[PDB]
């Protein structure tokens, strides 16, 4: 019982430390990259939340796929995806990314990004408003809040 | 019907250019299978390469054979550079069956295929 209490408080602590900052890498092919830059704006700060734009892949917390994936882009996309630390989460920003969008019935366009990586947050819009993307990142933080990792390790 | 050629005079110079291209592809395999960290033996890839050469075997116009020589030349330049990746070289193979045979009984169990 008291071991359960310790595991619960420790799991909540480390999940809180994970959901604290979460700096991504800005992948950003098309105009949704411009809107990522506009949610790096003074009027909508990533830096109030610990979110930092940083193209270093080896310290990427989450990854924002935003833009139009193509057949020539996809192998390099997953090759970037695999050189990432093991706690990883994916935010698909944009109508192109979360299901193909306007270029859906076309060659040289991967139908969304379910066909390459696992996706965790879908934020739609063309472009999704910085407002909407930031609501998506807050909902990502609350997904990280509900994870019970070390509790499942304890009752394993 | 005076039509311009591309390179050759009949199918004979076309055979010369395509056997030069086949020699280049044959001695171009082991560097690729050594470089790309592949998964398949040398002779199997060489057999599928010569099978691809066997595939187009009923072409008689000189312009078409010359243009296929040009296509193979472009692809050989790209493979002897490292511009292409592991996905493309595995995409030349067809390991993702789809084992769909020409058996009319097997064509009948999964059908509507004239």
């Amino acid at each position: 019982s008291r071991g359960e209490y310790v595991v619960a408080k420790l799991d909540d602590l480390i999940n809180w430390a994970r959901r604290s900052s979460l700096w991504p890498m800005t992948f950003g092919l098309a105009c949704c990259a411009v809107e990522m830059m506009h949610m790096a704006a003074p009027r909508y700060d990533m830096d109030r939340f610990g979110v930092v734009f940083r193209a270093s892949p080896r310290q990427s917390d989450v990854m924002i796929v935003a833009g139009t994936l193509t057949n020539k882009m996809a192998p390099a996309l997953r090759k970037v995806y695999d050189q990432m630390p093991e706690p990883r989460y994916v935010v698909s920003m944009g109508s192109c990314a979360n299901g193909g969008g306007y270029y859906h019935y076309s060659y040289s366009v991967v139908r969304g990004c379910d066909r390459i990586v696992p996706v965790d947050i879908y934020v739609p819009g063309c472009p999704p408003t910085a407002e909407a993307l930031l609501y998506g990142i807050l909902q990502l933080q609350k997904k990280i809040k509900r994870e019970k990792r070390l509790r499942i390790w304890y009752r394993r | 019907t005076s039509v311009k050629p591309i390179f050759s005079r009949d199918m004979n110079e076309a055979k010369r250019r395509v056997r030069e291209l086949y020699r280049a592809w044959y001695r171009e395999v082991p560097n690729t299978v050594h470089l790309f960290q592949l998964d398949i033996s040398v002779k199997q890839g060489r057999d599928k390469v010569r099978e691809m050469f066997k595939k187009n075997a009923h072409v008689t116009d000189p312009r078409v054979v010359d243009l296929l020589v040009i296509k193979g030349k472009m692809e050989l330049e790209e493979t002897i550079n490292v511009w292409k990746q592991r996905t493309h070289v595995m995409r030349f193979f067809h390991e993702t069956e789809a084992p769909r045979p020409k058996d009319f009984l097997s064509k009948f169990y999964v059908g509507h295929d004239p």
Binding site: P87, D114, R115, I116, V117, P118, V119, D120, E147, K148, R149, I152, R155, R156 | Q37, D39, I40, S41, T96, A98, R100, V110, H112
Partner: protein
Amino acid sequence: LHHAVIPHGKGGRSSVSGIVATVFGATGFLGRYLVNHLGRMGSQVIVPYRCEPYDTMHLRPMGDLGQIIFMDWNGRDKDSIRRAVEHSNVVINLVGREWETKNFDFEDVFVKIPQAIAQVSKEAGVEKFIHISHLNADIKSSSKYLRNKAVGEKEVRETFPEATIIKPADIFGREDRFLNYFANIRSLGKKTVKQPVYIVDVTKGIINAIKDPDARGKTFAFVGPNRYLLFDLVQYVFAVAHRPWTTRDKVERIHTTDRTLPHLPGLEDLGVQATPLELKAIEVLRRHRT
């Protein structure tokens, strides 16, 4: 039967095939390749789990748009399991932790779990249920592991007898247990024969058995196509590795006994080609040095 259960057109990637497969475990390695082959086939897969959604998330995008579905179960209650097999065409038991834990020893997982799920699956009325086990699981000595598996096979034959008991040999793939076990070393020289069999032809045989009729009731086994020496195996993985939870139960499982059985069909009798060690072993033996 109701429509939209028949196969539709071609096969694969929302070219709708026939079965609806409820799969247990499937966070594990063989279960992950089986889910991958069902997503290649394009059937609808229902997998329940008990872990974090992270692991089922990384096996998620292998499935197509909504074709796989994730639900939940516990290691005790029949209720969530029956809820998982309410609407289920076929069902497979792929469960098992290869050591004892503080909340689950070897008892009652292989004992209680196939009993309960075969009970509720017989009550639901499934066909072509397939339970996996290991080869050479006998009642005899020196193997709590294998004798619990033999008890479980007797359970599967006794309750819900219209099943398929199946057993492979030591299977190897990209995330093998024993190849990593032989790499993660530092070691004893004795006599042992052993046959390994590559994983994807095994699971293609599994899906061939589950979608084809005439194979119910029969128990199946899978045979390594060369059946060579343990010491030659260790020296071969040593020379190709280019470097000139380990309990006693695991090391006895890998050293003690392996043998063939002629009662029951192997690979090509079911209608699938078997492929030997060499090519895929050269594939998977990366991670030499820097």
